[PDB]
Design a binder for this molecule. Structure first.
Ligand SMILES: CCCCCCCC/C=C/CCCCCCCC(=O)OC[C@H](COP(=O)(O)OP(=O)(O)OC[C@H]1O[C@@H](n2ccc(N)nc2=O)[C@H](O)[C@@H]1O)OC(=O)CCCCCCC/C=C/CCCCCCCC
Ligand SMILES: CCCCCCCC/C=C/CCCCCCCC(=O)OC[C@H](COP(=O)(O)OP(=O)(O)OC[C@H]1O[C@@H](n2ccc(N)nc2=O)[C@H](O)[C@@H]1O)OC(=O)CCCCCCC/C=C/CCCCCCCC
Ligand SMILES: [Mg+2]
Ligand SMILES: [Mg+2]
Ligand SMILES: [Mg+2]
Ligand SMILES: [Mg+2]
Lengths: 340, 342
């Protein structure tokens, strides 16, 4: 059993991005496999590991792995100590004496972590940093600019108490509204701007789920599922429009083939992960495919010749096919390697 | 190291459903984590576990779990003995004496297994039983089940003798379905397309049987079956959609087919992704073969000239069933996740 004692502070009560700093550090430490005890004055319990944080601190590092005794530091600051169970036979109720004694007794290296010391003045800074910590793998210059463009939305939704599931669902309904209503009507441009607007909700729900500590398998599932639904709806709309009012059967056929191939490309990865093996490899990514399809469709909606769309649909189809082939090949390799 | 000694016989060399009985028992014992030694006369080696099979026997039980010393029996028959390492200090070179002495020394309980004693006369029977043990059929009458196994015995024999792999069967079958769906249907031949698809559809059951029979049960097999099954169904709906959007001149049917295509993809993806996440969802009102049956029968009927609204109705009902299936799966995985946090 691992125990972590954190000292109470005045600033731990402040609310940051929907949680308090106290609950946030507590849940953070919980993610590290520690049972958290808040203390004004320490009463030690029998256990194996002891992680002692004194000064108020915001830990920005996502995965913290603590193995063996050591000292926790950020930019010259000492944020906390990690002592083993032996320290229970040391601590006499005086802090510095027991610390310096355990340090004279034990030789410990220094471990670098991503953290910021809390102060009343730098809270804004802390918030900014916290926002920056959520990112990746993202777009690195572009990533920095990126955090800047999606930071206010995440901040706003976090402050209003909006859940990420709500965001995912609303976004998908928006995409469905653009794809299944405007497109069959023959409005390709406005449909495209609606879809494009409500598509970034995937990245939004990821930031909010990460920010609010909710995460989980359900979260991952929902993002993936609704993402699939979204793409399928987009292609469905294209297919419908060009089969009827668009009066272009060949585009409609290519779009339909792309719909099916998309479903199959997603299903390959999903089913593979289901068998316990893995396949992340493919040339075609959801956002890139989305981008080319949306840009082409929008262009055609502004009057660009439809053969551009024909070409892009051909290329996307072929890319989906070779991606499928790649995935099937690597899962084959994995299986045959697993049997041996 | 675990050792299993099986005594050599004249009939072990005979080939049954593509393998010899000898290789079959050896590979069976290999699946149990045993190193197999075939012997005309026993030479014992130092080891931990000793599994001794004397009489020629075809073991029909799939998973055999052996923990601790015990006696192996099938329907009153005693098929073999399981002795520990101590038996190395017993065997003096006589078989019967050391076995009966060790049986007099040690009290071992009796474990029931599914197996059949080999004889020259009953070979046909054995073949039948093995076949019957390998094939599943969902919700089939025991008469219907017997009949079904009876109709696939010649097929299994033929494919086993010709050297055809189960992968070959799955792929060929899927190509057949695709040939029916993406060629005949867009041409406007719904009936013949339907008969092509219906003919090449049973290949799923065939590849399951062959993969089980030839002992290739691995993760690759499951992957390939699932994937090509998805490809097949998607191709079927794709064909329907294409035909009815252009020459079939029925936009509402085409739309219903497209919606069903998407919902099908989503219903499958739900299960695949759920399993990927480590949770499970086997629950839904709709099963693949039943859906296949109603769709194919309706489409074929329309292809023989029956009015297309029948197909419209069946597509609506199938759509709704897919939707509620989606609800069940999403709801239960939600329940599981929320239950997992608690
Ligand atoms: C004039 C005519 C021109 C017409 C205009 C047409 C413009 C078309 C542009 C297309 C751009 C859209 C591309 C979509 C990107 C995407 O979705 O990628 C998702 C992609 C993957 O996101 P993801 O799979 O959802 O990850 P993430 O959301 O973080 O999920 C991870 C965690 O999220 C948690 N989670 C999620 C949801 C939930 N309910 N609970 C959870 O717990 C889970 O626990 C997971 O662990 O992210 C990206 O890579 C972002 C790419 C950046 C694209 C931005 C380009 C901006 C350019 C502006 C162009 C405007 C043009 C206007 C000109 C006029
Ligand atoms: C007059 C006009 C009338 C018009 C006529 C229209 C009538 C059409 C009738 C359609 C009936 C088709 C139903 C079968 C559907 C199917 O495929 O089952 C899937 C399903 C196959 O499931 P599956 O997923 O393939 O299981 P299985 O084959 O064992 O695969 C599992 C293992 O197989 C391994 N494997 C598989 C492939 C591989 N390459 N390697 C492997 O290792 C993997 O490792 C897996 O572990 O079959 C069933 O289980 C259900 C029972 C079959 C029901 C039979 C219905 C008969 C009705 C007769 C009607 C005829 C009408 C007469 C005409 C007049
Ligand atoms: Mg998302
Ligand atoms: Mg996503
Ligand atoms: Mg099969
Ligand atoms: Mg199958």
């Amino acid at each position: 059993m691992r125990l972590a004692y954190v000292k109470n502070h005045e600033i731990y009560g402040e609310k940051l991005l929907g949680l308090t700093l106290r609950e946030r550090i507590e849940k953070t430490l919980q993610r590290a496999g520690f049972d958290v005890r808040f203390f004004d004055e320490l009463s030690l319990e029998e256990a194996e590991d002891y992680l002692i944080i004194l000064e108020p601190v915001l830990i920005l590092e996502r995965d913290l792995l603590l193995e063996g005794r050591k000292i926790l530091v950020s930019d010259g600051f000492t944020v906390g100590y990690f002592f083993g169970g032996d320290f229970r036979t040391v601590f006499d109720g005086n802090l510095q004496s027991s610390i310096e004694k355990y340090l004279s007794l034990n030789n410990l290296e220094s471990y670098e972590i991503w953290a910021i010391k809390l102060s009343n003045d730098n809270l804004k800074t802390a918030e900014k940093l916290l926002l920056s910590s959520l990112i990746g793998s993202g777009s690195k210059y572009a990533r920095g600019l990126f955090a800047a463009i999606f930071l206010p939305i995440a901040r706003l939704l976090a402050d209003w108490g909006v859940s990420p599931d709500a965001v995912t669902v609303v976004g998908t309904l928006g995409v469905m509204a653009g794809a299944l209503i405007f497109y069959p009507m023959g409005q390709l441009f406005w449909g495209t701007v609606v879809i494009t607007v409500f598509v970034f909700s995937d990245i939004i729900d990821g930031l909010m789920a990460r920010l609010l500590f909710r995460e989980g398998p359900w979260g991952a599932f929902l993002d993936s599922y609704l993402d699939r639904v979204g793409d399928s709806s987009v292609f469905t709309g294209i297919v419908i429009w060009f089969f009827l009012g668009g009066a272009n059967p060949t585009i409609a056929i290519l779009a339909l083939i792309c719909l099916v191939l998309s479903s199959l490309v997603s299903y390959s990865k999903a089913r593979a992960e289901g068998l316990g093996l893995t396949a992340n490899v493919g040339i075609a990514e959801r956002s890139e495919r989305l981008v080319v399809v949306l840009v082409a469709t929008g262009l055609v909606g502004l009057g660009i010749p439809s053969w551009v769309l024909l070409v892009v649909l051909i290329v996307l189809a072929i890319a989906s096919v070779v991606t499928i082939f790649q995935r099937v090949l690597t899962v084959r390799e994995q299986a045959k390697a697993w049997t041996a």
